[PDB]
Structure formats: structure tokens, C-alpha cells
């Protein structure tokens, strides 16, 4: 089983290749990490296994979900420290995902009810609804388009939060640049309508994510920085006219950063739509051999370093990914929600618990969080 | 006792088990003419008292968007279909012909005089989807032509004539392919139908076309020989709707009314399940979980006065639970039936199943990947 061959992720000697994908769960009451997060990650940690935390706030304006953790205050650092200590006592490596939602927010999640910030003034269309603190779903408002200086301050918010993660004992951080959030709002040409140095060409639309990654690489080292992107996911109206083009341009920038710095990033982490059920339709699988369909392999081939694939992977699919060189590591989201011992289950090829969408974003520290049973 | 093998009275048709061959385009009907290979293919899969639904069958020269799909709009096609039906009936199976117009899901290569495909709209399917071309490449859907009410009535007439033709060929009945973004679904879904006449806008307006199609075929061959297939929640070919449950319920109410007005029940309602599963997103008109998906299916079933067939990713275990819980009366299987000619028997005995080869789903070979899948 290739999933359980060791892999050297930069400075971290992993004993297997099953990764916990980052997953917002909203148990961090008042944006402060709670003891329950420690129990949740401890359940899923394994000796030599890699974990990536739920998206974590980098500033008071970065939230778009209720009760998600921050790491921009020293109070949060102290609470994260206790969670990190418990995961490390199980021998796992854990990275903190740094998350700014950009325009995917609401006045209720913003200080003084301010407008959320983005690359643009265009709001997410009404095709999408935001989860509200009361449990209803609200409308995405009109965001404020930020100037060059505010962009530098946001970059500094990434830098300071990476430093805060190291201060909490995290082995590294992951830059959330996927799923139509702030970084994706600069990447995707379906969103970025700027005419300044951050908009227009492929090159200009990559400047934000380049500035963010370089800032954190300089602060804590390339080998403690992972970068997550989703060029082929159109979440929250974040589609690009050429996701192949955009993926390769990101890969180029990551390679140049690694070359300029003399060291490799911890990994590139690419996540894709899950098309598991498109086989049941007449035309669902037509086009599967086009280059744009082979995007995951194209980016892997162009990238120098560790590659984590994500989106719809199973035990069988993840084994195949590693053995074919499509990826070095495979991250699992939904399966890890309901299977705390997913690593053991994948190893034994044991049955897998089903997950419950209703309890993905509730505040209960136990129900739908830590009460999914072990084998 | 396996509930899949308790008998079922689907109108005047007495079935021995509830495992159904789902309708499956396979492209062996060279030049749109049923060939002997279809006879062998359907015979291999027929069982005593089993129900087979054929591949989508063209109702007119404009109705095709795959190569070498059969038609049933010529008498030559009727004659060749008759030999296939006879072979299936020889084994005691019930078989319905699925009548299928692809609408905008076509290409000039498939249309008379290279004309534009017809649809409710002039909007093409997006570049997220492809068409199978005759040479086996995957191509781009072109811009369709939106038809007026008179042309709509002529399409209705095509269905009616093709339904009469199927019964003439000996088919026990027909199925209306009103699902998966094809012509009928292009009228149903408000993600496709941007019309402003009496066929567009409101739900009732958007259900006009399928109502007239079903009523025409019902009146021509009798309601108990008509099945209706829909897919209210589906990504396929951009066929999304802002409210799939309410769209589904409105179709069900029209079917219930057609039944009450004609004094008889349709053969069945056939619903396919979504081609997706959510990942914690919140999109207008997308089902958010398998639970929301399951409730949608059962809500449609409970609202419909008659037989319910469910399809889309079913296994032996999920089919048994579906019938056991009363969520469906019959379960149609597609891909597993491609690779297991004796799928029914394998499900009865809980035997291992053959893998299937997607590569030969749509080739023209009369044997390879069609009839050479082994029996138990
Ligand atoms: N004894 C067996 O192993 C049997 C397996 N069966 C099926 O026959 C096929 C056997 O071939 P395989 O063992 O080499 O697996 P493969 O076809 O290469 O793909 C495995 C899964 O990945 C799915 N999958 C494929 N391509 C894509 C894609 N682009 N995007 C997302 N998902 C995809 C695929 O769906 P479809 O095969 O397209 O219907 C399938 O569910 C499989 O589809 C398998 O599920 C029947 C029952 C018996
Ligand atoms: C409840 C939930 C929360 C998620 N939160 C995040 C997140 O905070 N950051 C992120 O990059 N991806 C997030 N994702 C996406 C997952 O990390 C992962 O890419 C996706 O679920 C991959 O699908 P898989 O379940 O097939 O493994 C989340 C997914 C779910 C279902
Ligand atoms: C190769 C192939 C061809 C199909 N052709 C048709 C068709 O012509 N008409 C239709 O309504 N559905 C068609 N379908 C969808 C199937 O009828 C059925 O709903 C689907 O296979 C889902 O069930 P499964 O998991 O058992 O394969 C087709 C599916 C496949 C895989």
C-alpha cells in the first residue's frame, strides 16, 4: 500500500501519506480556539501523520463564518498552543491554514459592520448564500475594493499570523488560496476586474498570492509554508476563463519563489471538484481526456516539490494517486469528519462511517464533532 | 427474502422482480437503424418477468445528439425493432422504448442539412460539457435555434407518431425521456428556459411542454403504456433549476391530472438522482446533502399516484433498501447492467459483478464491450 510508505515533506518525516484536509467546523466560540478543537484534532492525529487545521482568521476582517478561530491575537496563540501540544504528543505534524474570506463575508462578521474587502466591488451573486450566526442563510453584500497600501497591510496580516502560528508551536502554515476567497478573488479573471498593477494579465492577477507567499516564506522559511489553490473550482462565482493557464502561472511563481529563496515550499496543495457521480449521465464523462481535464497532473508535472492532491479521493483513488506519481500526499476532507481513525481504516480497508452535513458548522463540542465512533 | 424479488404489478404488466434495465445509449444502431447486435444485447439481459427500458430512441430527424442511436420514426426502424422485441418477449421480459429528443444537446453533424439544433432557448450548453462526435472525438455544443409554438406542436406530433410506431413494433410501452438537460428538460429548467411566451417564465408555463408531450402519447397508446422520466436536480448539460423540489412536484401534479382525466394510470414515474453530492457549499438550487437528496426523491414518490422507479448510482444494497423502505417500487441499473448481462441473477445470488469498460460505452462494435461481457 503506497499510502503507508514514508515520505519526507521537507523537514518533516511523515510515516504515511493520508493528510487531514483543512475543514471549517465553527467550534471556536468567539473566534478563540476551544478545548474541543484539541479533542477533535487529537482523535485524528497519528504518529507521523500530517494535519491541516480549519481555516484560521488572519485579522479582524478575515471572517465569513461564525465562531471560526483566529491567530491574530496573542490570546488566540495561547489557546492554539494547548491544542498544538496535544497533537504533538501523538507524534503528528500540524499546519495552521491562514484564511481570509475577502468578499465572502457579511456585515455581521465585520468590525463596526464594515463592508468586506476584496479585489473588486462586485459582490458574490445571489446564486450563493452565506451562513448567518442565527442559522439562517443571508445575502453576500457589496464589498470594498482595496488599494495598493491596504494590500500591503493584508500581506502583513498574513506575515504576522504565520509568526503567531510558529509562536503557538505549529510546524508550519498553509495559505488558503482556494474556493473563491480573498486570494482567489485576485487570481480568477471572472472576479478580478482591476486596472492597476494587480489586475489584467495573468501575471498581474498572480501578484497578490505571490506577495503573500513570499512574505510568509521570508518570515518562517519556505519549508514551513504550504500553498492551497483551486484553479478549477468555481465556488462563490470564482471561475477563470483558462484554469490551465492560471494553474501553470501559479506554479511558475511558486517555483521562482523557491529558487529565489534557495529552499522548497512545504508543498503545493491543489483541490478539485468531485465528479464521482458524473459517470451516471450520458455526457458527464465526455471531455475527460482534454488537457484541461488533466489539470491535476499538468500542475504536478510543472511543480518542483511536494504535491498534495485533494477532492473526491477515496482509499482506492488515493492509493492510485500515490503509485502513479500524481501526488505525494492525499488529503481527505469529508471522510475525516466522520472517521476519526480514518488512517487506520484506510490501512485496514475497513468500512467508513457516513458524515452528517447538518453538524458540519454547528457549535456543539461533541455532537457531530467528536462523537463519530472509532472502529 | 430479498424485497427486490417480490413480484410487482406495474399496471397490466406482471413483473417477477424489481431490477430494471435503465435506458442506456450505446450507439450500435448503425445509421440509426436497429441492428441484430441490439437483439443479442437485450436478449442477454432479459429475464422472465423482468422489465427492460431501451436506449434513447430518436423521434425525428432532428432529435439525435449521439452517433448511431436508433430511431423509431421510420417504418424501416419499426421493422428492425420488431425483431429485437420478439427476441426479448420470447424470454418473457417486458420492454419499453425510450423516446428521446436531445434538443440543443446536438451538433450540425447530427442535423438535417447541417441545421442548428432546436431548443427552447438560443443559449448553447456551456463549454463545461462536450458532445460525442461521429469520429469519437469530444466536441463543443453549438448555438441552438429557439422554436415557436407551431414548431413545438410539430415536435409533440413527432412523439405521438413515434409512440404509435413503438407499439406497432411490438413494444409493451414507451418512456418519455424528459430528464438530464435534453429537449423536454430544456423547457422545464429555469436555468435553461429563458422564454417569454406561454412556454416560459412561470412553473406552469415551463411544464406546458412535457404536459402536452405526455398527453399526446397517452391519448395515442393508452396511459398504462407510458412511462415518464425526469431529473429535477441535476448538473448535466447545465440543467439546473432554482427550485428542483417545486419543479418536480409541479410535474407530478400534471402527471396525476393526466391520469385522473384519462381514467387510468401511467406505467410509472422514473426519477434519476442528482449527478453530484454537496461538499458544504450553499448554492441556489443545489441539494445540500444525501439526506436532502433522499427526502426530495421520497417527496416526489409520495406525491405521485402510481409506480415509482428510482435510478442513479444504485447498487445491490441501495436497491434493496430502496424497495424495503418503500422509497421506490422498482430500481433501474445502468452501468452494472452494461458489464453484467445477468445482473438480475447476480443480484439475486449476491454474486460478484464484472467491472465495466467506459471506453466501449459508445463505440460501434457489435460485440466488443457490448455482448461479450461474461455470464456467471
Ligand atoms: N470487480 C470490480 O472492480 C467492479 C467495479 N465496477 C466498475 O467498473 C469500473 C471498473 O474499472 P476500474 O476498476 O479500473 O475503475 P475506473 O473505471 O478506472 O474508475 C473508478 C472510479 O473512478 C470514477 N471515475 C472514473 N473517472 C472519473 C473521473 N474523471 N472523475 C471522477 N471520478 C471518476 C469511476 O466512475 P465511471 O467509471 O466513470 O463510471 C469509477 O466510479 C469502475 O468504474 C468500477 O467502479 C463494477 C462492479 C465490479
Ligand atoms: C465542512 C467543510 C469545511 C471545509 N473547510 C475548509 C477550509 O476551511 N479551508 C479549505 O481550504 N477547504 C475547506 N474545505 C474543503 C476541504 O478542505 C476539501 O478540499 C474538500 O472537502 C475535499 O473534498 P473531500 O471531502 O472529497 O476530501 C471544507 C470542506 C468541508 C466539507
Ligand atoms: C453509457 C450510458 C448511457 C445512458 N443513456 C441514457 C439514455 O439514453 N437515456 C436516459 O434517460 N438515461 C441514460 N443514461 C442514464 C442511465 O439511464 C441511468 O440513469 C444511469 O446509468 C444511472 O445509474 P447507474 O449507476 O446504475 O449506472 C445512460 C447512462 C450511461 C452510463
PDB file of N, CA and C in Angstrom, chain B residues 23-104:
ATOM      1  N   UNK B  23     -32.415   2.861 -19.236  1.00  0.00           N
ATOM      2  CA  UNK B  23     -32.182   3.201 -20.652  1.00  0.00           C
ATOM      3  C   UNK B  23     -30.758   3.696 -20.838  1.00  0.00           C
ATOM      4  N   UNK B  24     -30.079   3.182 -21.870  1.00  0.00           N
ATOM      5  CA  UNK B  24     -28.625   3.302 -21.973  1.00  0.00           C
ATOM      6  C   UNK B  24     -28.249   3.446 -23.445  1.00  0.00           C
ATOM      7  N   UNK B  25     -27.949   4.676 -23.857  1.00  0.00           N
ATOM      8  CA  UNK B  25     -27.370   4.935 -25.175  1.00  0.00           C
ATOM      9  C   UNK B  25     -26.063   4.161 -25.326  1.00  0.00           C
ATOM     10  N   UNK B  26     -25.975   3.358 -26.394  1.00  0.00           N
ATOM     11  CA  UNK B  26     -24.790   2.544 -26.664  1.00  0.00           C
ATOM     12  C   UNK B  26     -24.272   2.666 -28.094  1.00  0.00           C
ATOM     13  N   UNK B  27     -25.032   3.263 -29.011  1.00  0.00           N
ATOM     14  CA  UNK B  27     -24.508   3.663 -30.317  1.00  0.00           C
ATOM     15  C   UNK B  27     -24.101   2.470 -31.194  1.00  0.00           C
ATOM     16  N   UNK B  28     -24.825   1.353 -31.114  1.00  0.00           N
ATOM     17  CA  UNK B  28     -24.616   0.235 -32.030  1.00  0.00           C
ATOM     18  C   UNK B  28     -25.670   0.175 -33.134  1.00  0.00           C
ATOM     19  N   UNK B  29     -26.636   1.098 -33.122  1.00  0.00           N
ATOM     20  CA  UNK B  29     -27.724   1.148 -34.104  1.00  0.00           C
ATOM     21  C   UNK B  29     -27.259   1.914 -35.344  1.00  0.00           C
ATOM     22  N   UNK B  30     -26.367   1.263 -36.095  1.00  0.00           N
ATOM     23  CA  UNK B  30     -25.672   1.922 -37.196  1.00  0.00           C
ATOM     24  C   UNK B  30     -26.666   2.559 -38.155  1.00  0.00           C
ATOM     25  N   UNK B  31     -26.378   3.810 -38.531  1.00  0.00           N
ATOM     26  CA  UNK B  31     -27.235   4.628 -39.394  1.00  0.00           C
ATOM     27  C   UNK B  31     -28.634   4.827 -38.825  1.00  0.00           C
ATOM     28  N   UNK B  32     -28.750   4.802 -37.492  1.00  0.00           N
ATOM     29  CA  UNK B  32     -29.999   4.990 -36.758  1.00  0.00           C
ATOM     30  C   UNK B  32     -30.977   3.852 -36.991  1.00  0.00           C
ATOM     31  N   UNK B  33     -30.482   2.725 -37.472  1.00  0.00           N
ATOM     32  CA  UNK B  33     -31.302   1.552 -37.739  1.00  0.00           C
ATOM     33  C   UNK B  33     -30.957   0.501 -36.692  1.00  0.00           C
ATOM     34  N   UNK B  34     -31.922   0.018 -35.916  1.00  0.00           N
ATOM     35  CA  UNK B  34     -31.646  -1.116 -35.027  1.00  0.00           C
ATOM     36  C   UNK B  34     -30.973  -2.238 -35.806  1.00  0.00           C
ATOM     37  N   UNK B  35     -29.919  -2.794 -35.223  1.00  0.00           N
ATOM     38  CA  UNK B  35     -29.138  -3.868 -35.816  1.00  0.00           C
ATOM     39  C   UNK B  35     -29.326  -5.142 -35.003  1.00  0.00           C
ATOM     40  N   UNK B  36     -28.888  -6.267 -35.572  1.00  0.00           N
ATOM     41  CA  UNK B  36     -29.047  -7.537 -34.870  1.00  0.00           C
ATOM     42  C   UNK B  36     -28.333  -7.536 -33.525  1.00  0.00           C
ATOM     43  N   UNK B  37     -27.232  -6.792 -33.407  1.00  0.00           N
ATOM     44  CA  UNK B  37     -26.476  -6.776 -32.157  1.00  0.00           C
ATOM     45  C   UNK B  37     -27.329  -6.283 -30.990  1.00  0.00           C
ATOM     46  N   UNK B  38     -28.198  -5.296 -31.222  1.00  0.00           N
ATOM     47  CA  UNK B  38     -29.119  -4.887 -30.156  1.00  0.00           C
ATOM     48  C   UNK B  38     -29.973  -6.062 -29.709  1.00  0.00           C
ATOM     49  N   UNK B  39     -30.449  -6.862 -30.667  1.00  0.00           N
ATOM     50  CA  UNK B  39     -31.204  -8.057 -30.322  1.00  0.00           C
ATOM     51  C   UNK B  39     -30.452  -8.965 -29.369  1.00  0.00           C
ATOM     52  N   UNK B  40     -29.186  -9.251 -29.679  1.00  0.00           N
ATOM     53  CA  UNK B  40     -28.388 -10.097 -28.799  1.00  0.00           C
ATOM     54  C   UNK B  40     -28.173  -9.424 -27.445  1.00  0.00           C
ATOM     55  N   UNK B  41     -27.919  -8.117 -27.459  1.00  0.00           N
ATOM     56  CA  UNK B  41     -27.655  -7.363 -26.236  1.00  0.00           C
ATOM     57  C   UNK B  41     -28.857  -7.376 -25.295  1.00  0.00           C
ATOM     58  N   UNK B  42     -30.042  -7.068 -25.826  1.00  0.00           N
ATOM     59  CA  UNK B  42     -31.242  -7.042 -24.996  1.00  0.00           C
ATOM     60  C   UNK B  42     -31.667  -8.448 -24.594  1.00  0.00           C
ATOM     61  N   UNK B  43     -31.433  -9.436 -25.456  1.00  0.00           N
ATOM     62  CA  UNK B  43     -31.757 -10.808 -25.092  1.00  0.00           C
ATOM     63  C   UNK B  43     -30.911 -11.279 -23.923  1.00  0.00           C
ATOM     64  N   UNK B  44     -29.605 -10.999 -23.963  1.00  0.00           N
ATOM     65  CA  UNK B  44     -28.722 -11.413 -22.879  1.00  0.00           C
ATOM     66  C   UNK B  44     -29.216 -10.903 -21.535  1.00  0.00           C
ATOM     67  N   UNK B  45     -29.876  -9.747 -21.523  1.00  0.00           N
ATOM     68  CA  UNK B  45     -30.240  -9.079 -20.287  1.00  0.00           C
ATOM     69  C   UNK B  45     -31.684  -9.315 -19.877  1.00  0.00           C
ATOM     70  N   UNK B  46     -32.514  -9.825 -20.783  1.00  0.00           N
ATOM     71  CA  UNK B  46     -33.907 -10.115 -20.483  1.00  0.00           C
ATOM     72  C   UNK B  46     -34.021 -11.307 -19.544  1.00  0.00           C
ATOM     73  N   UNK B  47     -34.959 -11.207 -18.600  1.00  0.00           N
ATOM     74  CA  UNK B  47     -35.300 -12.277 -17.674  1.00  0.00           C
ATOM     75  C   UNK B  47     -36.814 -12.455 -17.660  1.00  0.00           C
ATOM     76  N   UNK B  48     -37.247 -13.658 -17.283  1.00  0.00           N
ATOM     77  CA  UNK B  48     -38.660 -13.996 -17.186  1.00  0.00           C
ATOM     78  C   UNK B  48     -39.388 -13.046 -16.237  1.00  0.00           C
ATOM     79  N   UNK B  49     -40.236 -12.168 -16.777  1.00  0.00           N
ATOM     80  CA  UNK B  49     -40.914 -11.168 -15.964  1.00  0.00           C
ATOM     81  C   UNK B  49     -40.066  -9.979 -15.550  1.00  0.00           C
ATOM     82  N   UNK B  50     -38.912  -9.757 -16.211  1.00  0.00           N
ATOM     83  CA  UNK B  50     -38.122  -8.572 -15.955  1.00  0.00           C
ATOM     84  C   UNK B  50     -38.499  -7.432 -16.883  1.00  0.00           C
ATOM     85  N   UNK B  51     -38.185  -6.206 -16.466  1.00  0.00           N
ATOM     86  CA  UNK B  51     -38.534  -5.000 -17.216  1.00  0.00           C
ATOM     87  C   UNK B  51     -37.276  -4.383 -17.819  1.00  0.00           C
ATOM     88  N   UNK B  52     -37.307  -4.198 -19.133  1.00  0.00           N
ATOM     89  CA  UNK B  52     -36.179  -3.553 -19.834  1.00  0.00           C
ATOM     90  C   UNK B  52     -36.633  -2.219 -20.426  1.00  0.00           C
ATOM     91  N   UNK B  53     -35.830  -1.182 -20.250  1.00  0.00           N
ATOM     92  CA  UNK B  53     -36.104   0.111 -20.923  1.00  0.00           C
ATOM     93  C   UNK B  53     -34.980   0.297 -21.945  1.00  0.00           C
ATOM     94  N   UNK B  54     -35.337   0.536 -23.196  1.00  0.00           N
ATOM     95  CA  UNK B  54     -34.286   0.618 -24.231  1.00  0.00           C
ATOM     96  C   UNK B  54     -33.501   1.919 -24.173  1.00  0.00           C
ATOM     97  N   UNK B  55     -32.401   1.954 -24.913  1.00  0.00           N
ATOM     98  CA  UNK B  55     -31.633   3.196 -25.102  1.00  0.00           C
ATOM     99  C   UNK B  55     -32.556   4.277 -25.665  1.00  0.00           C
ATOM    100  N   UNK B  56     -32.187   5.533 -25.477  1.00  0.00           N
ATOM    101  CA  UNK B  56     -32.961   6.636 -26.060  1.00  0.00           C
ATOM    102  C   UNK B  56     -33.123   6.423 -27.553  1.00  0.00           C
ATOM    103  N   UNK B  57     -34.344   6.556 -28.036  1.00  0.00           N
ATOM    104  CA  UNK B  57     -34.639   6.282 -29.459  1.00  0.00           C
ATOM    105  C   UNK B  57     -35.166   7.564 -30.098  1.00  0.00           C
ATOM    106  N   UNK B  58     -34.571   7.943 -31.217  1.00  0.00           N
ATOM    107  CA  UNK B  58     -34.954   9.204 -31.891  1.00  0.00           C
ATOM    108  C   UNK B  58     -36.439   9.205 -32.262  1.00  0.00           C
ATOM    109  N   UNK B  59     -37.083  10.357 -32.123  1.00  0.00           N
ATOM    110  CA  UNK B  59     -38.468  10.534 -32.553  1.00  0.00           C
ATOM    111  C   UNK B  59     -38.599  11.264 -33.884  1.00  0.00           C
ATOM    112  N   UNK B  60     -37.496  11.766 -34.455  1.00  0.00           N
ATOM    113  CA  UNK B  60     -37.493  12.598 -35.662  1.00  0.00           C
ATOM    114  C   UNK B  60     -36.072  12.823 -36.176  1.00  0.00           C
ATOM    115  N   UNK B  61     -35.907  13.306 -37.413  1.00  0.00           N
ATOM    116  CA  UNK B  61     -34.544  13.526 -37.936  1.00  0.00           C
ATOM    117  C   UNK B  61     -33.693  14.490 -37.114  1.00  0.00           C
ATOM    118  N   UNK B  62     -34.296  15.389 -36.324  1.00  0.00           N
ATOM    119  CA  UNK B  62     -33.575  16.416 -35.566  1.00  0.00           C
ATOM    120  C   UNK B  62     -33.243  16.004 -34.144  1.00  0.00           C
ATOM    121  N   UNK B  63     -33.591  14.804 -33.744  1.00  0.00           N
ATOM    122  CA  UNK B  63     -33.662  14.502 -32.330  1.00  0.00           C
ATOM    123  C   UNK B  63     -32.406  13.845 -31.778  1.00  0.00           C
ATOM    124  N   UNK B  64     -31.349  13.680 -32.586  1.00  0.00           N
ATOM    125  CA  UNK B  64     -30.161  12.920 -32.201  1.00  0.00           C
ATOM    126  C   UNK B  64     -28.999  13.835 -31.842  1.00  0.00           C
ATOM    127  N   UNK B  65     -28.248  13.433 -30.811  1.00  0.00           N
ATOM    128  CA  UNK B  65     -27.021  14.101 -30.423  1.00  0.00           C
ATOM    129  C   UNK B  65     -25.911  13.133 -30.059  1.00  0.00           C
ATOM    130  N   UNK B  66     -26.044  11.872 -30.478  1.00  0.00           N
ATOM    131  CA  UNK B  66     -25.035  10.822 -30.398  1.00  0.00           C
ATOM    132  C   UNK B  66     -25.019  10.101 -31.737  1.00  0.00           C
ATOM    133  N   UNK B  67     -23.917   9.436 -32.081  1.00  0.00           N
ATOM    134  CA  UNK B  67     -23.883   8.698 -33.349  1.00  0.00           C
ATOM    135  C   UNK B  67     -24.547   7.339 -33.220  1.00  0.00           C
ATOM    136  N   UNK B  68     -25.261   6.957 -34.275  1.00  0.00           N
ATOM    137  CA  UNK B  68     -25.736   5.588 -34.423  1.00  0.00           C
ATOM    138  C   UNK B  68     -26.653   5.189 -33.268  1.00  0.00           C
ATOM    139  N   UNK B  69     -27.499   6.124 -32.848  1.00  0.00           N
ATOM    140  CA  UNK B  69     -28.607   5.826 -31.948  1.00  0.00           C
ATOM    141  C   UNK B  69     -29.788   5.406 -32.812  1.00  0.00           C
ATOM    142  N   UNK B  70     -30.619   4.476 -32.360  1.00  0.00           N
ATOM    143  CA  UNK B  70     -31.761   4.068 -33.175  1.00  0.00           C
ATOM    144  C   UNK B  70     -32.815   5.158 -33.203  1.00  0.00           C
ATOM    145  N   UNK B  71     -33.588   5.171 -34.291  1.00  0.00           N
ATOM    146  CA  UNK B  71     -34.830   5.911 -34.351  1.00  0.00           C
ATOM    147  C   UNK B  71     -36.025   4.970 -34.303  1.00  0.00           C
ATOM    148  N   UNK B  72     -37.200   5.564 -34.162  1.00  0.00           N
ATOM    149  CA  UNK B  72     -38.415   4.772 -34.287  1.00  0.00           C
ATOM    150  C   UNK B  72     -39.413   5.612 -35.077  1.00  0.00           C
ATOM    151  N   UNK B  73     -38.898   6.522 -35.907  1.00  0.00           N
ATOM    152  CA  UNK B  73     -39.752   7.406 -36.690  1.00  0.00           C
ATOM    153  C   UNK B  73     -39.914   6.975 -38.146  1.00  0.00           C
ATOM    154  N   UNK B  74     -39.257   5.894 -38.581  1.00  0.00           N
ATOM    155  CA  UNK B  74     -39.472   5.321 -39.907  1.00  0.00           C
ATOM    156  C   UNK B  74     -40.053   3.920 -39.774  1.00  0.00           C
ATOM    157  N   UNK B  75     -40.701   3.454 -40.846  1.00  0.00           N
ATOM    158  CA  UNK B  75     -41.214   2.089 -40.815  1.00  0.00           C
ATOM    159  C   UNK B  75     -40.076   1.073 -40.903  1.00  0.00           C
ATOM    160  N   UNK B  76     -38.988   1.422 -41.585  1.00  0.00           N
ATOM    161  CA  UNK B  76     -37.818   0.551 -41.571  1.00  0.00           C
ATOM    162  C   UNK B  76     -37.326   0.329 -40.143  1.00  0.00           C
ATOM    163  N   UNK B  77     -37.226   1.413 -39.373  1.00  0.00           N
ATOM    164  CA  UNK B  77     -36.854   1.290 -37.967  1.00  0.00           C
ATOM    165  C   UNK B  77     -37.852   0.427 -37.206  1.00  0.00           C
ATOM    166  N   UNK B  78     -39.154   0.584 -37.487  1.00  0.00           N
ATOM    167  CA  UNK B  78     -40.155  -0.236 -36.799  1.00  0.00           C
ATOM    168  C   UNK B  78     -39.919  -1.718 -37.094  1.00  0.00           C
ATOM    169  N   UNK B  79     -39.643  -2.047 -38.359  1.00  0.00           N
ATOM    170  CA  UNK B  79     -39.430  -3.441 -38.752  1.00  0.00           C
ATOM    171  C   UNK B  79     -38.223  -4.046 -38.047  1.00  0.00           C
ATOM    172  N   UNK B  80     -37.119  -3.306 -37.972  1.00  0.00           N
ATOM    173  CA  UNK B  80     -35.932  -3.839 -37.313  1.00  0.00           C
ATOM    174  C   UNK B  80     -36.126  -3.929 -35.801  1.00  0.00           C
ATOM    175  N   UNK B  81     -36.813  -2.957 -35.208  1.00  0.00           N
ATOM    176  CA  UNK B  81     -37.109  -3.037 -33.779  1.00  0.00           C
ATOM    177  C   UNK B  81     -37.960  -4.263 -33.458  1.00  0.00           C
ATOM    178  N   UNK B  82     -38.874  -4.624 -34.366  1.00  0.00           N
ATOM    179  CA  UNK B  82     -39.790  -5.737 -34.114  1.00  0.00           C
ATOM    180  C   UNK B  82     -39.038  -7.037 -33.864  1.00  0.00           C
ATOM    181  N   UNK B  83     -37.938  -7.253 -34.589  1.00  0.00           N
ATOM    182  CA  UNK B  83     -37.163  -8.471 -34.386  1.00  0.00           C
ATOM    183  C   UNK B  83     -36.494  -8.488 -33.019  1.00  0.00           C
ATOM    184  N   UNK B  84     -36.099  -7.319 -32.513  1.00  0.00           N
ATOM    185  CA  UNK B  84     -35.492  -7.238 -31.189  1.00  0.00           C
ATOM    186  C   UNK B  84     -36.543  -7.450 -30.105  1.00  0.00           C
ATOM    187  N   UNK B  85     -37.723  -6.853 -30.277  1.00  0.00           N
ATOM    188  CA  UNK B  85     -38.795  -7.036 -29.304  1.00  0.00           C
ATOM    189  C   UNK B  85     -39.205  -8.501 -29.232  1.00  0.00           C
ATOM    190  N   UNK B  86     -39.321  -9.154 -30.391  1.00  0.00           N
ATOM    191  CA  UNK B  86     -39.720 -10.558 -30.408  1.00  0.00           C
ATOM    192  C   UNK B  86     -38.755 -11.409 -29.599  1.00  0.00           C
ATOM    193  N   UNK B  87     -37.459 -11.162 -29.758  1.00  0.00           N
ATOM    194  CA  UNK B  87     -36.455 -11.938 -29.043  1.00  0.00           C
ATOM    195  C   UNK B  87     -36.555 -11.695 -27.541  1.00  0.00           C
ATOM    196  N   UNK B  88     -36.826 -10.452 -27.143  1.00  0.00           N
ATOM    197  CA  UNK B  88     -36.983 -10.140 -25.726  1.00  0.00           C
ATOM    198  C   UNK B  88     -38.258 -10.762 -25.172  1.00  0.00           C
ATOM    199  N   UNK B  89     -39.359 -10.675 -25.925  1.00  0.00           N
ATOM    200  CA  UNK B  89     -40.606 -11.271 -25.461  1.00  0.00           C
ATOM    201  C   UNK B  89     -40.528 -12.789 -25.445  1.00  0.00           C
ATOM    202  N   UNK B  90     -39.731 -13.384 -26.340  1.00  0.00           N
ATOM    203  CA  UNK B  90     -39.520 -14.826 -26.275  1.00  0.00           C
ATOM    204  C   UNK B  90     -39.083 -15.268 -24.883  1.00  0.00           C
ATOM    205  N   UNK B  91     -38.315 -14.439 -24.181  1.00  0.00           N
ATOM    206  CA  UNK B  91     -37.835 -14.801 -22.857  1.00  0.00           C
ATOM    207  C   UNK B  91     -38.759 -14.339 -21.740  1.00  0.00           C
ATOM    208  N   UNK B  92     -39.896 -13.725 -22.063  1.00  0.00           N
ATOM    209  CA  UNK B  92     -40.845 -13.326 -21.041  1.00  0.00           C
ATOM    210  C   UNK B  92     -40.550 -12.005 -20.376  1.00  0.00           C
ATOM    211  N   UNK B  93     -39.760 -11.147 -21.008  1.00  0.00           N
ATOM    212  CA  UNK B  93     -39.469  -9.831 -20.466  1.00  0.00           C
ATOM    213  C   UNK B  93     -40.452  -8.797 -21.002  1.00  0.00           C
ATOM    214  N   UNK B  94     -40.639  -7.733 -20.227  1.00  0.00           N
ATOM    215  CA  UNK B  94     -41.378  -6.549 -20.646  1.00  0.00           C
ATOM    216  C   UNK B  94     -40.359  -5.507 -21.081  1.00  0.00           C
ATOM    217  N   UNK B  95     -40.624  -4.823 -22.195  1.00  0.00           N
ATOM    218  CA  UNK B  95     -39.679  -3.846 -22.732  1.00  0.00           C
ATOM    219  C   UNK B  95     -40.421  -2.610 -23.232  1.00  0.00           C
ATOM    220  N   UNK B  96     -39.937  -1.439 -22.828  1.00  0.00           N
ATOM    221  CA  UNK B  96     -40.433  -0.133 -23.245  1.00  0.00           C
ATOM    222  C   UNK B  96     -39.373   0.574 -24.078  1.00  0.00           C
ATOM    223  N   UNK B  97     -39.804   1.309 -25.098  1.00  0.00           N
ATOM    224  CA  UNK B  97     -38.874   2.068 -25.927  1.00  0.00           C
ATOM    225  C   UNK B  97     -38.795   3.489 -25.393  1.00  0.00           C
ATOM    226  N   UNK B  98     -37.591   3.952 -25.061  1.00  0.00           N
ATOM    227  CA  UNK B  98     -37.444   5.329 -24.598  1.00  0.00           C
ATOM    228  C   UNK B  98     -37.356   6.269 -25.801  1.00  0.00           C
ATOM    229  N   UNK B  99     -38.279   7.224 -25.863  1.00  0.00           N
ATOM    230  CA  UNK B  99     -38.333   8.225 -26.921  1.00  0.00           C
ATOM    231  C   UNK B  99     -37.600   9.470 -26.454  1.00  0.00           C
ATOM    232  N   UNK B 100     -36.654   9.928 -27.270  1.00  0.00           N
ATOM    233  CA  UNK B 100     -35.580  10.805 -26.822  1.00  0.00           C
ATOM    234  C   UNK B 100     -35.295  11.872 -27.870  1.00  0.00           C
ATOM    235  N   UNK B 101     -35.516  13.136 -27.517  1.00  0.00           N
ATOM    236  CA  UNK B 101     -35.087  14.266 -28.329  1.00  0.00           C
ATOM    237  C   UNK B 101     -34.083  15.066 -27.514  1.00  0.00           C
ATOM    238  N   UNK B 102     -32.888  15.285 -28.075  1.00  0.00           N
ATOM    239  CA  UNK B 102     -31.795  15.913 -27.332  1.00  0.00           C
ATOM    240  C   UNK B 102     -31.851  17.430 -27.338  1.00  0.00           C
ATOM    241  N   UNK B 103     -32.678  18.024 -28.169  1.00  0.00           N
ATOM    242  CA  UNK B 103     -32.761  19.472 -28.151  1.00  0.00           C
ATOM    243  C   UNK B 103     -31.429  20.082 -28.522  1.00  0.00           C
ATOM    244  N   UNK B 104     -31.010  21.086 -27.741  1.00  0.00           N
ATOM    245  CA  UNK B 104     -29.762  21.791 -28.003  1.00  0.00           C
ATOM    246  C   UNK B 104     -28.533  20.923 -27.786  1.00  0.00           C
TER     247      UNK B 104
END
